[PDB]
Design a protein around this ligand. Structure first.
Ligand SMILES: *[C@H]1O[C@H](CO)[C@H](O)[C@H](O)[C@H]1NC(C)=O
Ligand SMILES: [Ca+2]
Ligand SMILES: [Ca+2]
Length: 229
């Protein structure tokens, strides 16, 4: 179906739903909570999602957002993701589950219905993932179906980075481009039929988790979807 929205900043959150530890702060979406001294709270997850459901049958979309990873040490955890799931998808487990999965089914593709582009700051040993920080496409599992190295210079840049995520409903391809000002660029694509996974309504949004020593912020976000008939 057709949907568009545009948040150049978040001084309005009229159509954003906050769950778990996410909240609106300083004109941004703050995905995990900080204490009254500004210190990242361990072992929390949060979601900030566009509140209106849409459908993926016969649909393409384009979305872009800007984000900042704020770290307070060289060992930040866990990262965040932009995700699509059903409208009643709740905040799930903190830590390396990124607010998207739970321990007993996190690698079981038959037990999950969620697609995401993840920005993963902590190399987990509890499941298979690369030995470096990485950006990944996830389809119904915390073990990414496509993954690439995310350079530490960019992770720790303090820069406002830009993501572009697009879904071609004809070819059934999900693509992320991530760019850093005077830094790295990243390209990831995967063939996946999102209408087959999600035959009814979905919501799109963000999920962040700690971990430790990290806070994730979304500074702007826009979206457009269009029919492919
Ligand atoms: C355990 O804690 C580290 C931080 O010390 C990371 O958050 C990691 O993701 C955690 N492991 C799991 C399985 O969540
Ligand atoms: Ca990962
Ligand atoms: Ca991880």
């Amino acid at each position: 179906s057709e949907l568009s929205f545009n948040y150049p900043n978040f001084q309005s959150v009229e159509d954003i739903t906050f769950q778990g530890g996410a909240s609106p702060r300083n004109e941004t979406l703050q995905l995990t909570p900080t204490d009254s001294n500004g210190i990242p709270i361990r072992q929390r997850a949060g979601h900030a999602v566009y509140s209106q459901p849409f459908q993926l049958r016969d649909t393409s979309f384009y979305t872009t957002f800007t984000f900042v990873i704020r770290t307070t040490s060289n060992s930040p955890a866990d990262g965040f993701a932009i995700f699509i799931a059903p409208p009643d998808f709740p905040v799930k487990r903190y830590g390396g589950y990124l607010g998207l999965f739970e321990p007993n089914t996190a690698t079981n593709t038959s037990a999950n219905k969620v697609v995401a582009v993840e920005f993963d700051t902590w190399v987990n040993t509890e499941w298979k993932e690369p030995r470096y920080r990485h950006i990944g496409i996830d389809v119904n599992s915390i073990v990414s179906v496509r993954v690439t190295r995310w350079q530490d210079k960019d992770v720790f840049s303090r820069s406002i980075a830009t993501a572009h995520v697009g879904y071609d409903g004809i070819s059934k391809i999900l693509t992320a481009f991530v760019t850093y000002p005077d830094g790295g660029n990243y390209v990831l694509s995967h063939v996946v039929d999102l209408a087959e996974i999600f035959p009814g309504d979905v919501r799109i949004g963000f999920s962040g988790a700690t971990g430790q020593y990290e806070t994730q912020y979304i500074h702007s976000w826009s979206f457009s979807s269009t029919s492919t008939n």
